[PDB]
Design a protein around this ligand. Sequence first.
Ligand SMILES: [Ca+2]
Ligand SMILES: [Ca+2]
Ligand SMILES: [Ca+2]
Ligand SMILES: [Ca+2]
Lengths: 148, 20
Amino acid sequence: ADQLTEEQIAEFKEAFSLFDKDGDGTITTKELGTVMRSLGQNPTEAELQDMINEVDADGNGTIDFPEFLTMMARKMKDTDSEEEIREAFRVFDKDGNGYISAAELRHVMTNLGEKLTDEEVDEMIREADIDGDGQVNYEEFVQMMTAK
Amino acid sequence: AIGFKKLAEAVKFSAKLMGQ
Ligand SMILES: [Ca+2]
Ligand SMILES: [Ca+2]
Ligand SMILES: [Ca+2]
Ligand SMILES: [Ca+2]
């Protein structure tokens, strides 16, 4: 694994940039909180600072890129408990009908401060949309989590 | 810029950060 692939590095950049809202290279509690709220959580300031402290190896009070890689390494992997993707799916499936619509996905992107065209939203849906109905059902959401 | 898969991963990540 000596070196990463560029596709891997790009994925990590994607992830980090989502949280680093102003693009300055560091994630603050303000930014962490703002994004978490968009994605369905409601952490307190103290909770956010505890999250930073766990991975703030240089003690400077904010999270840089390698610190963020460590944060993902510790919180994610996969495994362990699992099966509350239903809550994850619900952050998208805002009306609970079993299908993430284009308007629902745009709502999430709008909470995050992004303004997407219909084509860009459809492009996102095509990552998971096996049956071509322009929506992501739970089964499709589950498949997308284990694929590629 | 962010893809749907990575966004759903970020939703999951946000939940794990809360102890869920
Ligand atoms: Ca920043
Ligand atoms: Ca730091
Ligand atoms: Ca729905
Ligand atoms: Ca579908």
